[PDB]
Design a protein around this ligand. Sequence first.
Ligand SMILES: *[C@@H]1O[C@H](CO[C@@H]2O[C@@H](C)[C@@H](O)[C@@H](O)[C@@H]2O)[C@@H](O[C@@H]2O[C@H](CO)[C@@H](O[C@@H]3O[C@H](CO[C@H]4O[C@H](CO)[C@@H](O[C@H]5O[C@H](CO)[C@@H](O[C@@H]6O[C@H](CO)[C@H](O)[C@H](O)[C@H]6O)[C@H](O)[C@@H]5O)[C@H](O)[C@@H]4O)[C@@H](O)[C@H](O[C@H]4O[C@H](CO)[C@@H](O)[C@H](O)[C@@H]4O)[C@@H]3O)[C@H](O)[C@H]2NC(C)=O)[C@H](O)[C@H]1NC(C)=O
Ligand SMILES: *[C@@H]1O[C@H](CO)[C@@H](O)[C@H](O)[C@H]1NC(C)=O
Lengths: 215, 215
Amino acid sequence: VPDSIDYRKKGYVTPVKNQGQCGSCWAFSSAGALEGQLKKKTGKLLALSPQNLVDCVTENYGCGGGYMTTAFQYVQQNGGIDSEDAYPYVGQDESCMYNATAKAAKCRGYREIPVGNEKALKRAVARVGPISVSIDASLASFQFYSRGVYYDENCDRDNVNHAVLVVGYGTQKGSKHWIIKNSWGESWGNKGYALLARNKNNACGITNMASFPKM
Amino acid sequence: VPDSIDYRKKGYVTPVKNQGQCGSCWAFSSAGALEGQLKKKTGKLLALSPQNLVDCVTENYGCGGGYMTTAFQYVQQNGGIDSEDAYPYVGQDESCMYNATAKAAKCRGYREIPVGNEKALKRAVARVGPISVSIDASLASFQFYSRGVYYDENCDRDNVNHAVLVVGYGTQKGSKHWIIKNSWGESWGNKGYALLARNKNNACGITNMASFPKM
Ligand SMILES: *[C@@H]1O[C@H](CO[C@@H]2O[C@@H](C)[C@@H](O)[C@@H](O)[C@@H]2O)[C@@H](O[C@@H]2O[C@H](CO)[C@@H](O[C@@H]3O[C@H](CO[C@H]4O[C@H](CO)[C@@H](O[C@H]5O[C@H](CO)[C@@H](O[C@@H]6O[C@H](CO)[C@H](O)[C@H](O)[C@H]6O)[C@H](O)[C@@H]5O)[C@H](O)[C@@H]4O)[C@@H](O)[C@H](O[C@H]4O[C@H](CO)[C@@H](O)[C@H](O)[C@@H]4O)[C@@H]3O)[C@H](O)[C@H]2NC(C)=O)[C@H](O)[C@H]1NC(C)=O
Ligand SMILES: *[C@@H]1O[C@H](CO)[C@@H](O)[C@H](O)[C@H]1NC(C)=O
């Protein structure tokens, strides 16, 4: 269980994208966790298609929200997910334009993190790879974040509303933290990433609804 | 376990190639099995590089022969194998031009089939996918094969000499058989493939030295 890991360094994370006015955070987190596991099983890093999931996960609400665990199950039961090149993101709802030949990755299921167990998520990021998580992104202080180890005592520990991708953890200026990839472009945060308070009583509900895919 | 399986049908096999005057049959067999497992885990069929292995598997003899098991072990310790596009075949010895960004597949080790146990190999083809094997391909009846279920009682069950890739099994005109991909071009055999006698006492030593990579 290392003290510090940054899966960007290790070639596991695709470039930050911008979801725009579509509410498709859940699909960027899914594709992000699956990108990491495809890299771990293979040697190649390949950006997979959130649009694939936006259009096709019927048990989700397209641009109006969804879950990662059900996204994973779609790609499992669907037996594949297309690549972003095959199925580029357009940020608006449409019919399932899935094409089974442009298939770039598969899924054998998912496992969920124990709710409220930051010590557990620390091991999971280190062992598995980038972990899909859900947070409270509703406060103004989180939307306009740019630097430092985010910590807001009004961040709701009990309810979440926005999906991101945990890509590491560590410590900066003596404050332990999670490293997150958001889907708000590189203009947001620190080149699209942030550092959130860690081991501080589940700040913003990071482990309230976390999962990762099996491959 | 099915009566019949044909991984050509399922998109698991790349097109037949021609090894030429280089003795690198073992490398096409290896890459073929790695192609099969990459398709099973990810869904994409991508032709991998035998030249990668010819140049870089130091414990093999390059164009002068080699083993699939030692090829697999290279890709494990090397942490990757390049794609045929990145590292095209030239049918001649040269220096290890491996490029880790062109990594297209990895290996976690290998497993061997019980020697002389066709019933076991049948399970592996059905369960795992295409299995690298070695046979006696030295006789004229095999060189001039074009159609039907190959069977020569003079085929050496004890000393194999040429690597192929078992890509299925089944039955034709009441003769149980293996389906193999050879590396002698499409002009040989039935568009580069053949059918070898199965459950006829380990014909041509088909199970004498069979393995597949772990991923
Ligand atoms: C080892 O293998 C490496 C990988 O091989 C490739 O992969 C597979 C498919 C193989 O089968 C090969 O066929 C491939 O070559 C080899 O590395 C490749 O080498 C090529 C030649 O040196 C490179 O192409 C040349 O470079 C550009 C094209 O740029 C490409 O870059 C990436 C590649 O994935 C991508 O676009 C992104 O580029 C930036 C990547 O960092 C990215 O930067 C981000 O920018 C953000 C802000 O904008 C932000 O700040 C981020 O922080 C920042 O990182 C960009 O934003 C893009 O998103 C595209 O694929 C893109 O195509 C091009 O200029 C060159 O064209 C020349 O061609 C002609 C001359 O004939 C003429 O027009 C000009 O002279 C022109 O200059 C050329 O295409 C390729 O990029 C490179 N790929 C990688 C991944 O490294 C390597 O050579 C091999 N080495 C050896 C020794 O074998
Ligand atoms: C699916 O994608 C492939 C390219 O990978 C393309 O050749 C094929 O026509 C596509 N199928 C459609 C558009 O139905």
